[model samples]
Target: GSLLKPARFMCLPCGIAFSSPSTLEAHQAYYCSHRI
Candidate 1:
């Protein structure tokens, strides 16, 4: 059987496409406004 990868991911609340895990992590670090 072949494993499948998700084409996209929706942000937890905003429902936006993250594209990749690294991008999502960076967004969470900067865009979320929770850290700074």
Candidate 2:
């Protein structure tokens, strides 16, 4: 647990984690089933 940890954005409904905000945004916008 000594490595530099990157930030993660998680989608609760999809149980998915993205390394960056843009990827997470796209997932929610186009790929996530729980998008609203």
Candidate 3:
């Protein structure tokens, strides 16, 4: 809990995280839950 994290997009539902915004949208299209 003491580590500092960088600015990145993370999908909580799928437990997925990306380092780039470009892949974020693409990855979310397959994973992230919208109405969850």
Best by TM-score: 2
Distance from true location, Cα of 12 in model 3, Å: 0.6
Q: Pick the candidate with the highest lDDT.
A: 2
lDDT of 1 by residue, 1-36 (tens): 565864445566656667677777677666665553
- lDDT by residue (1-36, candidate 2, tens digit) is 765853558877778888788778789887675566
After superposing candidate 3, which stretches have Cα over 4 Å from the reference?
1-8, 33-36
Model 3, C-alpha of 18: deviation from truth (Å): 0.4
Each model's Cα RMSD:
5.3, 6.5, 5.4
Better of 1 and 2 by TM-score: 2
Q: Rank the candidates by lDDT, best first.
A: 2, 3, 1
lDDT at 34, model 1: 59
User: Candidate 2: how large is its RMSD?
Assistant: 6.5
**lDDT (10s digit) by residue, model 3, range 1-36:** 765854657877687778888878777666664332
Q: Lowest-lDDT window of 10 residues in candidate 2? A: 2-11
Clashes of each: 0, 0, 0
Give the TM-score (vs. native) of candidate 1: 0.44
Using all chains and alpha carbons, the TM-scores for the candidates as numbered come to 0.44, 0.56, 0.55
